[PDB]
Amino acid sequence: ALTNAQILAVIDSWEETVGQFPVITHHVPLGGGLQGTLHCYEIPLAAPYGVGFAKNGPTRWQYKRTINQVVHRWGSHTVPFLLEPDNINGKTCTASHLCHNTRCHNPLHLCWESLDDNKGRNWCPGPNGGCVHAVVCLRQGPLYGPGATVAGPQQRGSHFVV
Amino acid sequence: ALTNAQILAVIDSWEETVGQFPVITHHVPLGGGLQGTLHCYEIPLAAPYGVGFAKNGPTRWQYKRTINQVVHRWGSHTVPFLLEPDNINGKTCTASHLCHNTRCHNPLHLCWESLDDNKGRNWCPGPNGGCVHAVVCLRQGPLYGPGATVAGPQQRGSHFVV
DNA sequence: TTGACTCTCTTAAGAGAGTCA
DNA sequence: TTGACTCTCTTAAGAGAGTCA
Ligand code: NA
Ligand code: NA
Ligand SMILES: [Zn+2]
Ligand SMILES: [Zn+2]
Ligand SMILES: [Zn+2]
Ligand SMILES: [Zn+2]
Numbered sequence: 617a618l619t620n621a622q623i624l625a626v627i628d629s630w631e632e633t634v635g636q637f638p639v640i641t642h643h644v645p646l647g648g649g650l651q652g653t654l655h656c657y658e659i660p661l662a663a664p665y666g667v668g669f670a671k672n673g674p675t676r677w678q679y680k681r682t683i684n685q686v687v688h689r690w691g692s693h694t695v696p697f698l699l700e701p702d703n704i705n706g707k708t709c710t711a712s713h714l715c716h717n718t719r720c721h722n723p724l725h726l727c728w729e730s731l732d733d734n735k736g737r738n739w740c741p742g743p744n745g746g747c748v749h750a751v752v753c754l755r756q757g758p759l760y761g762p763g764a765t766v767a768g769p770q771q772r773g774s775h776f777v778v
Numbered sequence: 779a780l781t782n783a784q785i786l787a788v789i790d791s792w793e794e795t796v797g798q799f800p801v802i803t804h805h806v807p808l809g810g811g812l813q814g815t816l817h818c819y820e821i822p823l824a825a826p827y828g829v830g831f832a833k834n835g836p837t838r839w840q841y842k843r844t845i846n847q848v849v850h851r852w853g854s855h856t857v858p859f860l861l862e863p864d865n866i867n868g869k870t871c872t873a874s875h876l877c878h879n880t881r882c883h884n885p886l887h888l889c890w891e892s893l894d895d896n897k898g899r900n901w902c903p904g905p906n907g908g909c910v911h912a913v914v915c916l917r918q919g920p921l922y923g924p925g926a927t928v929a930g931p932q933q934r935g936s937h938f939v940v
Numbered sequence: 941t942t943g944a945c946t947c948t949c950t951t952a953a954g955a956g957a958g959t960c961a
Numbered sequence: 962t963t964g965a966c967t968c969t970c971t972t973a974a975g976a977g978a979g980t981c982a
Contacts, residue, residue, distance in 0.1 A: 704928050727929060729925060767871075771885045
């Protein structure tokens with residue numbers, strides 16, 4: 617809601633409900649050829665999802681609570697960061713999945729950062745492969761790799777130089 | 779529609795016009811604390827842009843040629859790759875700026891790959907910092923670094939485990 | 941045949957708010 | 962009050978197509 621004590625109450629009930637979502641074990645690449653284990657708290661695939669949760673998109677959800685007879689609603693993954701600044705250097709803060717598992721709501725698998733910082737983790741080498749993120753990645757990005765480039769830099773004539 | 783010889787002629791006229799665009803020398807990071815130099819052929823900021831060129835967006839342009847009475851138009855950066863497959867792994871190929879300078883049309887600074895591969899280069903450490911792209915980067919991605927995370931993984935109670 | 945404009949669309953990481961029961 | 966749906970928007974990497982002289 618509006619008060620400091622009201623926010624904390626929204627965060628506590630949120631944690632409480634998410635703490636009951638089924639816990640699924642996921643083995644993941646860490647970089648450097650090493651492997652780790654993550655434990656995600658995943659929102660169900662279909663209703664009911666849990667007290668206060670409703671699906672607004674294939675993989676989008678919202679959490680809502682009635683405070684003083686006035687209902688408040690937030691993005692399902694933003695609740696843990698309700699007391700932090702909502703922007704940085706003029707950029708909007710977003711909930712970033714360190715586990716790269718959208719259905720997961722485990723706050724130990726989320727961070728609060730710019731959309732650019734958020735996206736970038738998709739290509740990070742991982743905690744054991746070279747990650748330089750101040751708030752370290754939990755795993756190697758699912759998109760990290762050599763890529764599959766169809767054609768590289770090229771010219772037919774002689775008008776350009778690198 | 780167009781024959782292979784006709785497409786080649788289109789690539790030749792594109793190179794001839796782009797080659798006359800102002801050439802700007804840029805000093806850039808290559809990773810490993812090393813500094814490099816890139817020479818970008820930049821399309822003007824306002825009309826006229828050059829024979830066959832027209833702006834369709836703040837930072838988007840198109841190239842068009844009329845052959846045998848029929849008008850042909852392509853994205854301005856896609857021309858160098860008109861003789862290559864247009865998709866890979868069920869994904870559409872896109873023009874990727876190795877120099878991260880949108881206005882640049884230097885073909886020696888572009889590659890043809892999926893949008894995901896394309897985006898990823900924004901966070902690459904660079905050719906001298908550990909880049910693993912099969913078609914190597916020309917410089918360090920502008921977004922590579924520790925980031926500016928506002929809040930990290932946290933919980934108030936004890937319902938969660940990593 | 942050309943130049944200088946106009947418009948909306950794609951992706952995959954993310955969001956906001958309204959309609960019913 | 963709480964649940965289950967519906968709709969469109971944001972961003973920064975990229976696109977196709979129309980009008981008019
Ligand atoms: Na993310
Ligand atoms: Na790019
Ligand atoms: Zn998770
Ligand atoms: Zn990282
Ligand atoms: Zn360039
Ligand atoms: Zn690279």
